[PDB]
């Protein structure tokens, strides 16, 4: 039978750690889509619609990560895109219709399967227009892309280039309906926190009756992002028509020191495991002490790059080690401690 949201969440926790809200939004969305496909005859007067999600999280949080994980468990055709490449119709740049083209290739030409699919347009925050003010020049990569996508989200019949997918000899443009395809957008929206503050925080000024916080008591980016409303997104450079096509708005929270420690060992393909494989394929064991992980977490927070910051810290700590160790002989295992992360000490290599 169809899978329940709890099952999906388990699949999403094997790879991601620390984002409970996003796992539910995507789980219910997939649940709805799965039942919305089985009930294709629509034996009722109602015309079941669709709800589009818009994952808004800070850098290095797992937006693109979740999308990839979904493709592992689901069966229907799934596709990935990049809004930075999309351009308005009539230019050398890519067209919105190319998305369906890539979807057809993953659907095996099964129009029915393609008509009920899930897309993940990444970097949806880079296509935002300069500002609410009118644009003096035609923003081919900005509004043009947004206005061109409007019909895809609400429903339309896109003309996909022929002689594609799994059919080389074809001349008649294939028609596909985009009324049952759940488009899950996603962006980083760097700079939104300031826009949100102008609404959630008022009174900031000079005087005895004004408001001052000093950044010590001020709310964090995650907190501010959880209060986002469409009025804010308009300032960021998103036309109101675009937000209306994205009713559901899921907000991610900035990873915590505790969560970063879990990301190093709990996930299926955790960073640490990747490095261990390298040391192991050449013939050496590698392990990291619990205290080491705690130090790494604190340093990563300073970089403000999420989980990506971790790779920098780890690479630096064992840079010299990974350059000379391949030549070393009579070595069986390596052990890194908290001291090595700060440089005061050097890794103790167990000979044997």
């Amino acid at each position: 039978a169809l899978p329940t949201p709890h099952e999906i969440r388990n699949h999403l926790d094997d790879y991601v750690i620390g984002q409970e809200q996003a796992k539910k939004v995507l789980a219910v969305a997939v649940y709805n889509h799965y039942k919305r496909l089985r009930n294709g005859d629509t034996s009722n007067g109602v015309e079941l619609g669709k709800s589009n999600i818009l994952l808004i999280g800070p850098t290095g949080s797992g937006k693109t990560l979740l999308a990839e994980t979904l493709a592992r468990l689901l069966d229907v055709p799934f596709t990935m895109a990049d809004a930075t490449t999309l351009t308005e119709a009539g230019y050398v740049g890519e067209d919105v219709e190319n998305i369906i083209q890539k979807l057809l290739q993953k659907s095996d030409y099964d129009v029915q399967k393609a008509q009920r699919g899930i897309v993940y347009i990444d970097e949806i925050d880079k296509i935002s227009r300069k500002s609410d003010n009118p644009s003096i020049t035609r923003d081919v990569s900005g509004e043009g892309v947004q206005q061109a996508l409007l019909k895809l989200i609400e429903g339309t019949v896109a003309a996909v280039p022929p002689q594609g997918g799994r059919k080389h000899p074809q001349q008649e443009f294939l028609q596909v309906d985009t009324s049952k395809i759940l488009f899950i957008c996603g962006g980083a929206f760097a700079g939104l926190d300031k826009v949100i503050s102008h609404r959630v925080e008022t009174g900031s000024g000079i005087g005895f009756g004004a408001t001052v916080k000093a950044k010590s008591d001020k709310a964090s980016e995650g907190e501010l992002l959880a209060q986002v409303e469409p009025e804010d997104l308009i300032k960021f450079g998103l036309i109101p028509e675009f937000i209306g096509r994205l009713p559901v708005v899921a907000t991610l929270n900035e990873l915590s020191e505790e969560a970063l420690i879990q990301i190093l060992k709990e996930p299926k393909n955790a960073l640490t495991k990747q490095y261990q494989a390298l040391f192991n394929l050449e013939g050496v064991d590698l392990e990291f002490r619990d205290e080491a992980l705690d130090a790494i977490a604190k340093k990563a927070m300073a970089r403000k790059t999420g989980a990506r910051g971790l790779r920098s810290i780890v690479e630096a700590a064992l840079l010299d080690t990974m350059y000379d160790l391949p030549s070393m002989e009579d070595v069986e295992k390596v052990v890194i401690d908290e001291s090595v992360i700060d440089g005061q000490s050097e890794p103790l290599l167990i000979y044997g």
Binding site: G90, Y91, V92, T137, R138, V140, P161, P162, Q163, Q171, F173
Partner: protein
């Protein structure tokens, strides 16, 4: 460079084997838009025609060497595009090897969309359904003498680029 052709259904136009239909309507339009032009023919097409074409600066793109002088012979695509030079219109009419080799360098496409159902090993590459936009429309619906259709069309491609002007 305009790759004048017909692209018969299944690309059965025919170069290695003498043209099945051999109708005056297809040869008249051809002659009309080829006179004095450097038509880059080929060995297979020379076999089917043979006859020196009055005026036409015939350029037989052949994999083998050149023998005749009346009609020039070229061996490489660089030598074939050098003979013609930069003239306003080149009617490449050679073999499949010639047709496809000059396809990346084609601007216009004087097609004929013939319907003749034949078979063989000589075929043309595919044509971009959207890039090649038909600008000219002339209907030549199949007549009694003209067994299949010979609808003449003209195509071309265009694209737009932004400038992002500042101040």
């Amino acid at each position: 460079i305009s790759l004048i052709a017909a692209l018969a259904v299944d690309r059965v136009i025919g170069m290695e084997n003498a043209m099945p239909w051999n109708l005056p309507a297809d040869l008249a339009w051809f002659k009309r838009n080829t006179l004095d032009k450097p038509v880059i023919m080929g060995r297979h097409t020379w076999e089917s025609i043979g006859r020196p074409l009055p005026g036409r600066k015939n350029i037989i793109l052949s994999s083998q060497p050149g023998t005749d002088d009346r009609v020039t012979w070229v061996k490489s695509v660089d030598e074939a595009i050098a003979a013609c030079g930069d003239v306003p219109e080149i009617m490449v009419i050679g073999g499949g090897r010639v047709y496809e080799q000059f396809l990346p360098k084609a601007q216009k496409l004087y097609l004929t969309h013939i319907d003749a159902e034949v078979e063989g090993d000589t075929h043309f590459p595919d044509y971009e359904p959207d890039d090649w936009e038909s600008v000219f429309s002339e209907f030549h619906d199949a007549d009694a003498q003209n067994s299949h259709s010979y609808c003449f069309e003209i195509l071309e491609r265009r694209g737009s680029h932004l400038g992002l002007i500042e101040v």
